[PDB]
Each structure stands twice: as structure tokens, then as C-alpha cells.
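Q: For a teaching session next week I want to show students how multiple molecules come together into a single three-dimensional assembly. I've collected the sequence lines for a complex. Could you give me the predicted C-alpha cells for the whole thing so I can convert them for display?
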Amino acid sequence: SQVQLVENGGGCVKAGGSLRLSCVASGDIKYISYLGWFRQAPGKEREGVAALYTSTGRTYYADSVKGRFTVSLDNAKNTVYLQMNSLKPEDTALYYCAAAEWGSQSPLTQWFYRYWGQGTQVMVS
Amino acid sequence: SQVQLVENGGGCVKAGGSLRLSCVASGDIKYISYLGWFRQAPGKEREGVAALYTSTGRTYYADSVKGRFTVSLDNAKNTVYLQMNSLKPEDTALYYCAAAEWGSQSPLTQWFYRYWGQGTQVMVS
Amino acid sequence: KIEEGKLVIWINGDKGYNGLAEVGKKFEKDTGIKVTVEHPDKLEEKFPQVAATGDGPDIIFWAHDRFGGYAQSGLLAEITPDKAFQDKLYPFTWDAVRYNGKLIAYPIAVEALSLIYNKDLLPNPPKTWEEIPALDKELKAKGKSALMFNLQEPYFTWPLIAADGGYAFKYENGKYDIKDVGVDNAGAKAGLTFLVDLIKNKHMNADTDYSIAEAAFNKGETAMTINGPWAWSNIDTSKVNYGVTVLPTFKGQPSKPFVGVLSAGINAASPNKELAKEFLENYLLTDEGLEAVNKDKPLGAVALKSYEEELAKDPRIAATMENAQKGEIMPNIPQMSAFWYAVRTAVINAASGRQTVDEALKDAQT
Amino acid sequence: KIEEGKLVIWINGDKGYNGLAEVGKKFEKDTGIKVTVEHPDKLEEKFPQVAATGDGPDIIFWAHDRFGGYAQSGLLAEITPDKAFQDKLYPFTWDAVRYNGKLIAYPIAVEALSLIYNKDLLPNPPKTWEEIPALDKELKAKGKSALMFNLQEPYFTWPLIAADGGYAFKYENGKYDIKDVGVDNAGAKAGLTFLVDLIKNKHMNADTDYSIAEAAFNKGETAMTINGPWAWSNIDTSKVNYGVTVLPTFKGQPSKPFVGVLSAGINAASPNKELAKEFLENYLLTDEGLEAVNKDKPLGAVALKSYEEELAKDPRIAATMENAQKGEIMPNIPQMSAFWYAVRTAVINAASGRQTVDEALKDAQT
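A: Of course. Below is the structure for the complete assembly, covering every listed component.
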């Protein structure tokens, strides 16, 4: 596996707090055009929370997190970030980082992406 | 900087729980012989919590964490781990990862090490 | 490393793993050999990692595009099907599992793009791309739109571009010619010119993407859209009276969408190759096995004819099968990362107006 | 990028940053140019990173070993001190800051290993290494031990090994000869033979490390130990009646501990070089500036003689200075990562008995 994703920045945050997450991509990542973020509660289906289109900068957000989460990619650092603002207790889950060169379906689907990271845990009380 | 340290695996953990931290070293790390772990409470001096000697496998632990923490290094993965067992509320701090080729003082001193990581945060309630 | 006397099969989590388990139960009832069905997370990266060390499942299920790279790495063993079983599957499906002149896997299911149209807003979908402007003007006279789809994906924009002879890599005698690329040929130039003309004439928006197209179609604002079988559940939930037909032709030539074939590969280090082949040929790739797997999770078009004419009663399945037959089979070599990048850049440049069609296609070719 | 009209100095957090701030206040009172003193975290890593981009502090404080690599990267500007100021500092201190025939930084403080002995258990420390076995036997007759130190560090084991002509890299006319290494010469062979003989004769434990040695000396279980100025505070807390003297000689030749010199470098991209040089020469490197810095944080031996004889009233400072003078100045080239690795492997192999002294030194050399 020449493409690796590492997640960090998950923390214990009260309701209404702000948190940020980072995902570093290493290796031959010149052909990756989609960067997406996924969260998975224990015993729950992995749901798409955000997605980014590298070629044009287009961003995708789910209905539950629209207007609250901001995802951006730093080309000079090869790292994608997601701003977790206005947190609620329902937002606690294991947050994953995903990347894919291309796809035939919606960029908010887990099967859309090929590369997956280890994941980080964010808890909101 | 050819040597990079990334800290991950720190999470919101209740009292008495068990947590494991990971620190991945990348680049020209063939000459590093000391791996150390440091924790720093907000507004507090950075204190040494554990240290590892790569050449012989010798380990060092502070008095407050002796018999409770276990630090080990995986050569096949170039990652050093520390097992945080029997947690107490006093253990909350920002945990750092440190590495050094050599040193002239005790391996539990912050000035001993040359390479420093970003740091992971562990909270115990 | 792989335990003998039993079969281990790894399948993706979006496929029919329970149906695969039922087929394995039938196999163990028939022969006495237990079958284990699993859906490991991150399968696409886990399978090569464990296969490089001589471990992994006996049988692997994945799309045929990665199977070429797997066979290049030596992670797939050669299969030896007889002519009797080969005649049971389609010639293009057999072509999908050919690398270096040797068969490497067994085709299972065939997926391809198809034209999805609204029956209420359009009882008779057009058969040609040239009718789309007139139909769109007629619908705009009623305050609607005819067709908009994902323009941000080369996988979606290829059927129109490569309708008149365009192709990704030249295929001759079971080998793909890397140095021969038809991105900037006359047919692709004409297709991209038609696409950019449609964009400029306000018939379609250059910023339209998958989410916008899907929302517009399920809200009844459009007459046609281009999508695969994966959205059929979404339109069914949206309760839109939709139909699926063959993609419109361009200058008399049928569209050539990319064809993805789900196929069954055999691990090179697996010591249960004979029983795996027997299971695939006589218990999985049968009418009962295919119908069980489809009952668990739909597969769309299938390689077997004995079940393909059975599924042909569904107009959507028939349209998907004919579109796959008329389309371009997806090759299995690593340089299509570069191919996707180049075609995406050319399409964005042509749609955004920064570069002309000829310049964009030349840049993609180079 | 660096703002003109002011001085920015970056210093480590374990040094006298408050004293540096006081010296900067004196400088701004005298001249009208403000001085900013900071103690950034991860200084040794961030300073090259910001200096490679044309930014960073005007003056940098660090040991001279990394200044060679900094000059190789071009991050240090050549200084031009006159003979009057050069005579104020020691010739070996000036040598420690010379690379490629040019002076790159101003020496500040000198640190080196020294012999620390217990006055109560040993009023007269031995002057030779050959007396240590007899002294250890006499102390073991009373249930104590003579000397145990860090055998796990080449930095600590070097003074005994390189006492009789051993050296790391040959130094001639301001240049270090990489191809000329004296790891396996006669003097180093004799020193390592003496060390392994001491280990085998139960006089010292091969597994003894820094923590064990420090605890044993602070608990009064040992008569002597080898440590730098950094352990003086710990011993003072332990209230052990300790003394610091010159390291014992081997075969009549004094020990050669590695010498680390804190030095003042000037950024190449800094446009305030003239005022930085004036500040260093006339306000920092003076008796008042050195005493102001030492009041905040002790510096041990200093490059300036005017402060050096004044500090010489302390026996510990005098012993550290004489040990540094008789020792080997630490060179400043990157290959000593390999040097440390090789010497550490040789020492471990010799002490553990897996390899003989000659074989271990040959392996370290190769």
C-alpha cells in the first residue's frame, strides 16, 4: 500500500465546543482527486459526513452537518482538515479519513473510496 | 527535518481505564537510539514519563508511573507504543513523543532529546 | 498458511455476503467441505497485503480492473475452464478476465451506465443525442429540463465522447497497447465538441455534479439522467415513475460506457484451487446460486446467460445488459490513474472555456 | 523577512534567558536598539527550518556541533573579530567555532565531563586510572564501591578509551579528515582493554547506566562518579559531601572527554549583522553580561578569561575548565551519528563478551 492515511486531533469536547481533525496522506498521492471524511458509531453503519473535490475545490456536506463542518485540504502539506464547530452529543463516533482517485457514485458513500485510514475517535458530552 | 514524530491514540478515558499511545518515526531514523515519552499539563513543566533504549531494550519509568506504564518499540513498524494502565485523574496532560541519537544526561529530561513530536492529549476524569 | 480442506472467500460489504453464505452452505451439504464467507473492512487494500505474504482468502471477489494488477503482482492463479463452461458465459465477460493471454478469474456480474428517463415527463426517450437539444427546448417551454448528469467524472462523460471511435487503450489479441491512445482522435473530438456545444447552448450546466443531478431527477425537475444501478434504490424511494433504456446514439454509433465486471479470482498461494474451481463452476455460477445472491443483494446484469435471460424480464436489467454489451470494457492496467487525470483535466478545461476542445484533448493525450 | 533596527535572539529553555533579557536591556539603554529574547520549544529543529527560508532570529545560541551543519546549509554568516577580541578568548574555544577556515560563531560557555568524588569516603581522589582497582578493593573491604558511571554512552566511555592517543576524526589546519579515524589505534585499544578488564574484575558492572550511577552516588554507595555540571544540582539536593577534580590519567596521559561549547551564531539572512556583532563583542561577552547570565542560570566554564579566572575560585568550575582544556573538542560534521553508533556497538560488544576488544574496534572502524 503506497497510500496511507493517518488521523489525529480527536479529543474530549463538551457540547457546543469546537474541534479540528487532521489526515495526512503519504506516498504516490498525485492521482487522488476526492478527499472524504466518514464517522462510524460503535455498532452503526459508517456514514459520510464531508467530502472534498481536489480538482475544483468543491465541497460536500451531509444534511445533519451542513453549515457546521468545514473541510479543507492543504496542498503544501498534503493534509486535509475538517473543522468540527457547534458540537452536539449526537456527533460522537469514530471519524475516518478516505481518499479515492475516482468514483462512479456519490462522494458521500463508503464504497466510493478505495483508500481508508485508521480513524480517530471524537466524544461529545 | 528528516525525522518526523506523529502522536496518535490519545482519547477521553475514564478513571481506571487502559489506553495505548502510538508514535511513528519516519525518515532517516537509523541512528536514533533513545525513544522517550513526555507529558505536559497546561501551564506546567514538561515531565518525563518513560524512556526506552533501542540498542539493549532497557526501559526507564518515573516514580509516579513505575509499574503502571509499559513502553515498547516495534522495529518492523518503526513505531513506539506506551501502555497507559491503571489511569488516575492526575495523569491528564499533553503527551509528547521524543527521540534522540545520543545524550549526555538522564534519558528522562526534555533537553536530552533532539526530535520532538506534535503531541497527543489524554484526559482522565 | 491457508488451511486446506475448507474454502475462504472475501467479498465486499455492499454485495450479497448472506447469499454467498447460503451458496457455501449448499456446497458443504453437497461435498462435506465447509465454506467461510467474510466481508473484511478495507478489502481493496487488505487483499493484496495478505496475498503478498502467501496468505488470504481462497477466492476473492472484486472488479476486474484491479485483477489485472493483482495478476501482475502474481496474487492470482490461472483458471482452466473447459469450452462447455466458457460457452455458458458471454465472450466479452470472458474478455474482462483476460490478462497476459491467460484467464485469471471467473466473471460474476456486469455493471455499466444506462439512460434513466422519467416516464411521466417523457413516455418516449430519444434514441439519439441530437434530439436532446430540441427536447430540452420543448421542456424548457414548460419550465423544465431534459437531461443533466455528472460532468465532473470522466467515467460519466466517456459514453458521449467515445461514441464515434474514441477509446482509452488499444486492445488487440488479448493485450492493451499503452502507446496507442485514442483520446484525441476524430470521434472523441466530435463527442467532446457536442458536449461543449450542449454546455454552451444552456442545455446543461458545466458545474452540475452527482448530487445536483440526483436531487434534480428525484425532485421531478428533469426528464432524463445518466446513472448506474446503484441509484435505483434512491429513485425507488423517491417514487419517480422512471424508466431505464439504452443510452442515446451519437452520429448513428451507440454510446460506449465503461463496463465493470465483478469477477471471482483464485489466490496463487491457496492450496484449495481444485475445490474452489469446482465450487465456482458447479455451485456458485449456477441459476440457484445467482438467484440466492440476487435475493440477498441485487447484482444487476450477470455473466451467465441461463440467469441473464431470466433477469431480462426487468427492463432496467435488460437496458443495463445491452449498454454493457455495446460499451467499452474497462481495462485492468495501472496507467489509468493517469488516464483518469488527463481526461478529467481535458473535460474541465473544455467545459470551463479556458482551453479549446482540440487543445484540451491534445494535452490529455500528451 | 527579518525586521531591521532590532535584534532577535533564540536561546534554549534550560539556559539563562532572563539574563540574556537583562543584557538586551543594557544594550537598548546604551544604544537605543531593542532586543527580544525568546526560548522557543523545539529550537534545534525549528531554527534550521526558518533559516532555510530566509527568516529566523538574528543571533542563535546552541552547541558548536550543530553549527557545522548549519554552516553547511549556509544558515550562518562569517564573523570578523579583531585580534584584540580574539586574544580575550581561549584558542581552543576559537577552534571549536572554526569551520572551512572561517569563524562562524562566538564561543560563550564550555562544558565537559569531570570526575566527581565523595570527600567523606575519599579525601584524596586518585590521579591515575591504575589506582582505581586497588581503591575499589579497599572500599569493598568496607562494603562500598569506588566508581561506576555510564557505560551505555560513548560520550561517557570516551575519556578512558581515547586517553593514550585515541581520537574520533583527525583534525589538521582547521579541517577534519573523515577518512582518518583512530577508533582502533593502539591508545584506544589499550583504553578499551583497561575498561573491559575493570568490568571483568567485578570492579564495575557492565549494565550500570546513568540512573543507577546517579542513585548510587546520591545515596553514598560510591566514592567516585563521572558526570557533567548538570548533575551538580541533583548532588546538592542529595547533600553529599562531593568534590570535583580532574579526570584520572591513563598511562601518564590525561583523559580526553568530549568538549561541548555554547556559541553565538549569526543568521546569514539577518540584516542586522553589524549591531549583532557589536552587541556580542561589547555587551554580552563581557564580565557584566556573563555574570548577569550566570545569576539566572549557571553556565559552568566560560570562553572569556576575564570571567574564567573569576569563576576559577570554584573548584568544580576550575576542574571542569581544566578537563575541557585537556579534552577533545567535539567536531561539527554529520557523520558522528555513524561514529556514535559504531563506538556504542563496539563498547557493548566488548563489555558483553560477545566480541573481543580488537574485533569490536575493527568493526567500529569499518
